[PDB]
Write a protein that binds this ligand. Structure first.
Ligand SMILES: CCCCCCCC/C=C\CCCCCCCC(=O)OC[C@H](COP(=O)(O)OCCN)OC(=O)CCCCCCC/C=C\CCCCCCCC
Ligand SMILES: CCCCCCCC/C=C\CCCCCCCC(=O)OC[C@H](COP(=O)(O)OCCN)OC(=O)CCCCCCC/C=C\CCCCCCCC
Ligand SMILES: CCCCCCCC/C=C\CCCCCCCC(=O)OC[C@H](COP(=O)(O)OCCN)OC(=O)CCCCCCC/C=C\CCCCCCCC
Ligand SMILES: CCCCCCCC/C=C\CCCCCCCC(=O)OC[C@H](COP(=O)(O)OCCN)OC(=O)CCCCCCC/C=C\CCCCCCCC
Ligand SMILES: CCCCCCCC/C=C\CCCCCCCC(=O)OC[C@H](COP(=O)(O)OCCN)OC(=O)CCCCCCC/C=C\CCCCCCCC
Ligand SMILES: CCCCCCCC/C=C\CCCCCCCC(=O)OC[C@H](COP(=O)(O)OCCN)OC(=O)CCCCCCC/C=C\CCCCCCCC
Ligand SMILES: CCCCCCCC/C=C\CCCCCCCC(=O)OC[C@H](COP(=O)(O)OCCN)OC(=O)CCCCCCC/C=C\CCCCCCCC
Ligand SMILES: CCCCCCCC/C=C\CCCCCCCC(=O)OC[C@H](COP(=O)(O)OCCN)OC(=O)CCCCCCC/C=C\CCCCCCCC
Ligand SMILES: CCCCCCCC/C=C\CCCCCCCC(=O)OC[C@H](COP(=O)(O)OCCN)OC(=O)CCCCCCC/C=C\CCCCCCCC
Ligand SMILES: [Cl-]
Ligand SMILES: [Cl-]
Ligand SMILES: [Cl-]
Ligand SMILES: [Cl-]
Ligand SMILES: [Cl-]
Lengths: 312, 312, 312, 312, 312
């Protein structure tokens, strides 16, 4: 029909609330996730008021095509939501209760500066456009905001799901808008990365470092170059999960430092052999004896400094 | 139309049953499977009752748009089911029979603690929301629960398909709900993993262990490091099927233990060569003679202990 | 409208036939293929009969919404077919001709026991459910079963497309059903597997076997271990096409036998070097001279026995 | 309505034409491409004729649901086209002009005998089925066949887009059909394959051939076996683009010849070392001196013969 | 209804404007991106004019099915846009305001000559077809062209979004068209390619170059051939992102030059060993001493020349 007339030019208030039923398919590369939830609306149309004692009923049921329903839209979705109407009810005073169940695909940026040990906030924006004869604003009904106890995200820990009460009001396309923000806080589960990636890589590194207790040039070359090939295959497996970012990240810095260490170890081996050939064995012995202690300490200090820089 | 009036404020009972026709596309990473089944409903509307001897017919056929049909929904599906109506029939006493065929995509968590030798239970939840003038509850009709003899899941053995008779009743969004649980028990087929993964890996391990019967440092390095590269490529192939979990699993523990063994073998080779160079051949001979027996026994004991810890 | 009345309680017969237009997207992992075909129906409604000489026309054309059309369904499809109606015509005696063009996705198990040289049969099932006032049965019209001369499946040779004349009658959900089976026989094209997989692998095997004409331990280790790495990469490429089965297959047995051969060759090399070091050169010479002949003959006999076991 | 009546039992002619707007997503494995084009129809209905000077208009506009429009279908598409109607106009004499814009997915076989330097023809078939009271035939209107100047296929050069004027008439399902063929000729862009695949492979081959200027058995084994591993990784990368064919192809023959060359080079190395050990150095020197020239000449002659066999 | 009548045979002008809300899924291989935006239209229908003081309202609201709306289409989209109507309003003078929100998939070529450091322009074309009784032309309304502050493309920097004011007028299918061009300028974020690809490759190159400070033929072969295997795996990882082009590109030229360098280094090693064996040590010493300086300088000069050729 037509939007409800004002009595003294007041804004119409619409009370919202979202109840989460499902959450799945969080994609890091595309920065998307799928949702399945309820949507609840409530407003007041004085034209719908009835007498209870006369009609003999306290509650009225309507079809969606018989009354005026405001148009509420999601802002950061790919296509329009797929929704069906659950129930419409009207109170004797005039207030109408609206409920529907929908599904949608949401777009939301992510931060990867602490990739294996990070936390993300996901947003859902709701907007409504005013009409030429009425002003509409949004409100939050805290009795209708929640989630199911069975909601699970594969690889994440859900912490909270709250709304910002204050809406943002502005002008878009020569018309006034009102916007609402729903937030969902999550935490990555990082247990499996330790014995899957971290410890095997340290094992390969320590296996490469055994070249400082040997004096055979050929076995030293084999050791180092083959451990480097294995490092490359590990890096290639790891880089498939992380997308490209315009800022430096923890894992990338670690990987670059590992390459740098392999380079310096090759240089040390080559210098040792060169000095040996040139009949200067004492100098090569002292250099390898120094390197034996120097490499792990500098590795440990580099790692401590990096962890303080990124997480402190 | 309108929900059937109560006679003395009693709850309306709706008898359900699901007959499985197809089951396919079980995805471990996304924890989803597709289904194709029948759905059967039965209730009583006294307003539909007729006389058999008068009309001259015992059974009445209606369209779906001519009578009141309760709204039944699936809880853990991605989008609403695609369904068509097969037949609607009404009995002379008032009972109506409903049948439809649907397709849907279901979400269900999985446990991977015994990944190659595990068993899964899959759930399907059915819910119905009460109306403002009547209370609706769900019941199970055991004469209409079953599956086809041609249902096949690629890589799984189907065991049973039963329902829990007792429904769960609660309040959601200031309205009463009733929920039903259907369970499907399956078992992985694990025959192919043995000669495909398990035995070749043991072959590579035993091939790496031949370095305790040799005294050549270069061939020992080649042997061990190349077998380690092959182990890495096997692990990389295997890790594509298992998703990330927040708990320890059998396969991951085995793989970590294999890396640990390779590390210790490199250390043994290096110690042997170092003692040989230093003119202490008896000590190196005794160490390699000890290691020859020590490695397989400790492997076997570790494996027995792990298998008792995970399956016992 | 309503199903055609019986004259003396006889079953209504419906004559079917499928004409294939397209066949594509045969997926081995998912055991599915896509189809595009005609569907032809024919039955008799005495209520439609007219006089030819009166109306002045011999053939009558109807819309699909103006007459009763039986409901025919496909049993092993994922979702309901997408179909449109081509023509409906009625004969003066009462017989009606029905034609439509559809598309669907079909599910059908496959056998992989002779994977590179196998043959498959694909099934399509058609079912019809009886109504409360009439019994319906299915028949096959052999004048309307065929395929186009341009039907092509990428990698397969189509042999025949026939129907089983006798239908299967049973009771489902307290109602009678009738089912029909359409079969399509195909054969894999195996020419490309020979110079793509088989011969290169034999080349690598023969290249590994050159270690019995050498007495250098390091080159022998390099030869064998590197050929084994190449075998692993070939196996990893091959295993992507075959899905997991619960029975043994020809290719898997060949691959396991190849691993076993590599293991035994490593053992032979190690024994040879060990005996040489221990100052027993005659025994090592005799062992390598024996192995030179022993390996290819045992390979050939194993292969003959396996081929007789699987194909004989 | 109803198909236009004949005057003296003549066939109705329908003039067609396709104007290409877009062409994208050419898939070699699945032998499919997507299209976006116009479709133009023209015929004569004497029942639509009007007087221009009376009505005061020269052109009449109708809705698609108000007149009879022939049913035109595409033969080698996966699903029915998605189309919308652009304009319908009628001439005072009776001729009607029809225009629509559609999108579709087309199936078309490809030939790969000259894979990097091949040319393909793509077909689009149009069919129409006669009715029980009229015969319909197809014609080509050369003033309405063309393509846009912005049509681009990623990796192909478009040459021409023409139609065969003569239609093919036959009987299908006891009814007459008429079929039309549209052809689109393309050519692969082969510039990038040279410095991406061809030249690096020749570099690896020439690097393997340096073993004829050396007398060290271990470095010769390392050289050859490692170059063979690199050849295998190149072949594995290349084989992902080409599908399986039942005939021999140029690239596959080249790859098989490369494997054969590696085999023969390993044999040469082994024979050389064997003769050296046996105290026959002159014979090994002469054999390696012969091989130095023999290998590249036989490679070049083999390549010339293959190129003449496939392209001549 | 019917298009608005001209007063003195003038063209109808339609004022357009696009406001960007979302931009995502830029695919390099397929040259596509997804968009979500507003669309604004404005024209004048004298038949809609009313009196404000009489009706007592200044603004009129219509349904989309009650008035004539011009047909506007996108030219380089895959399928027709998914759109819904937001508001329709009419001014007392006769001007009508139109707004809608749509989603579409756009096709647009890309240039890769400076792949890691390139900039792209993306186009969106709008067309309208004239009718048989009126001429329609397009105009640009600069007060309705813009984008949101939250628009983000994963891996790109958005610079501007403007329109070309002058439309292109021509004749298509014997009817006049008008076309408009919207442009969107972007820039790749290239920070992550440096420590991810560029520097590790230089490390491997410098590690291969250590063979000019050694006189052991076997370690030199191991060094060079293994670094070449690592280069091949890096190239294989990199080539998955770039599609095939018919012109030369910066990255491909760099990669080819790296292969050429590896070839020449193998040749140098082989010549050195050959001269050493032949008892000419001074000549081999001088050659390796020359190569030590010659290789990096020629690399640096080649790189400078290439960078000037492609970016200067
Ligand atoms: C030789 C063997 C070398 C093994 C050295 C192991 C050194 C590191 C082990 C411990 C690292 C963790 C530090 C403390 C972390 C902590 O407080 O726990 C929090 C955190 C919770 O993980 P979330 O994803 O948030 O929850 C999912 C699981 N509950 O728990 C962990 O980090 C657990 C880490 C256990 C890994 C132990 C390594 C496995 C193999 C050990 C081999 C020993 C022989
Ligand atoms: C040198 C060769 C070394 C070969 C050593 C083999 C050692 C292990 C072989 C047997 C392991 C199985 C123990 C018993 C298992 C059992 O009771 O059977 C149950 C189970 C059923 O599998 P499901 O997936 O549930 O059903 C699908 C197939 N029916 O069957 C098996 O596990 C069968 C295992 C057979 C594998 C034999 C290995 C193949 C090659 C052997 C080479 C011999 C030369
Ligand atoms: C810090 C994190 C790890 C750092 C990287 C370590 C790489 C691997 C190191 C290998 C050590 C090899 C030492 C070796 O070969 O020496 C044998 C050495 C020589 O001793 P003597 O002959 O009595 O000394 C005479 C002069 N006083 O004898 C031994 O057996 C020493 C003990 C070796 C076993 C324990 C070594 C543990 C190595 C790494 C553990 C980290 C986890
Ligand atoms: C040194 C070179 C070593 C080369 C040794 C080759 C030994 C095997 C070659 C022949 C194997 C086939 C046996 C007979 C098979 C037969 O009767 O043909 C049937 C069958 C039909 O294939 P379908 O997929 O059903 O149809 C598609 C193609 N028409 O044809 C074949 O199997 C053809 C096999 C030819 C392969 C020849 C190998 C290619 C390279 C040879 C190199 C010679 C130098
Ligand atoms: C437990 C599971 C497997 C454990 C890992 C095994 C790795 C491979 C082991 C290789 C054994 C090599 C032994 C070797 O080289 O010795 C040759 C040895 C020396 O004997 P004599 O000179 O007479 O002894 C003089 C002093 N009494 O002679 C032989 O031929 C022995 C027999 C060797 C063949 C059988 C070996 C089987 C090896 C593993 C089988 C597991 C499956
Ligand atoms: C040491 C360096 C060794 C380099 C040796 C190079 C030997 C081959 C180079 C030339 C091969 C081409 C023969 C003539 C081909 C011809 O006539 O051109 C047609 C054809 C057109 O390609 P289309 O896909 O149809 O169109 C897209 C591009 N216009 O052009 C080509 O084939 C161009 C080939 C150029 C490749 C040059 C190799 C690149 C690097 C050279 C390194 C030199 C130092
Ligand atoms: C069966 C299928 C293949 C089996 C696996 C074969 C692996 C490769 C075998 C390599 C053979 C190497 C032989 C070798 O080095 O010997 C050189 C040998 C020594 O002869 P004399 O010094 O005169 O003998 C003195 C004592 N009567 O001289 C030769 O040149 C022999 C001929 C070698 C070339 C032909 C070899 C063919 C090898 C495999 C072909 C299979 C395809
Ligand atoms: C031993 C270690 C060797 C390290 C040598 C490093 C040599 C190159 C480092 C600097 C290269 C960049 C030149 C100047 C570029 C410039 O002006 O900046 C623009 C540009 C902006 O990137 P956009 O994608 O447009 O924006 C996203 C990030 N803001 O910034 C860069 O290029 C930054 C480059 C920093 C890379 C530093 C390398 C990382 C590790 C260094 C190890 C040192 C120890
Ligand atoms: C045909 C296509 C390529 C074929 C495959 C080539 C593989 C690589 C070949 C390597 C050649 C190595 C030659 C070598 O080591 O010899 C050094 C040789 C010995 O000469 P003298 O001692 O004076 O001779 C005394 C007796 N008259 O001295 C040299 O420096 C010769 C020149 C070597 C550099 C040029 C070689 C080019 C090699 C391949 C180019 C193809 C592109
Ligand atoms: Cl929405
Ligand atoms: Cl549902
Ligand atoms: Cl169906
Ligand atoms: Cl079509
Ligand atoms: Cl459009």
């Amino acid at each position: 029909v037509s939007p409800p007339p004002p009595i003294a030019d007041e804004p119409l208030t619409v009370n919202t609330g979202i109840y989460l039923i499902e959450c799945y398919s969080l994609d890091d590369k595309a920065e998307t996730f799928k949702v399945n939830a309820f949507l609840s609306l409530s407003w007041k149309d004085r034209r719908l008021a009835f007498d209870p004692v006369r009609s003999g009923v306290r509650v009225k049921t309507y079809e969606p095509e018989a009354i005026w329903i405001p148009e509420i839209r999601f802002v950061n979705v790919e296509n329009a939501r797929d929704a069906d109407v659950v129930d419409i009810s009207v109170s004797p005073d005039g207030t109408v209760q609206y409920l529907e169940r929908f599904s949608a695909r949401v777009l939301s940026p992510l931060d990867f500066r602490r990739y294996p040990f990070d936390s993300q906030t996901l947003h859902i924006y709701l907007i409504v456009r005013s009409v030429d004869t009425r002003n509409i604003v949004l409100a939050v009904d805290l009795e209708k905001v929640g989630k199911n106890d069975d909601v699970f995200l594969t690889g994440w820990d859900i912490e909270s799901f709250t709304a910002v009460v204050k809406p943002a009001n502005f002008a878009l396309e020569d018309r006034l808008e009102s916007k609402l923000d729903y937030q969902l806080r999550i935490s990555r589960q990082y247990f499996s990365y330790i014995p899957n990636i971290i410890l095997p890589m340290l094992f390969i590194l320590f296996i490469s470092w055994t070249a400082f207790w040997s004096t055979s040039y050929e076995a030293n070359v084999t050791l180092v170059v083959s451990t480097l090939i294995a490092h490359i295959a590990f890096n290639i497996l790891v880089e498939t999960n992380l997308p490209k970012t315009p800022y430096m990240t923890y894992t990338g810095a670690i990987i670059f430092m590992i390459y740098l260490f392999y380079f310096v170890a090759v240089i040390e081996v080559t210098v040792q052999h060169y000095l040996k050939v040139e009949s200067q064995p004492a100098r090569a012995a002292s250099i390898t004896r120094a390197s034996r202690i120097a490499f792990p300490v500098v590795f440990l200090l580099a790692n401590i400094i990096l962890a303080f820089l990124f997480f402190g």
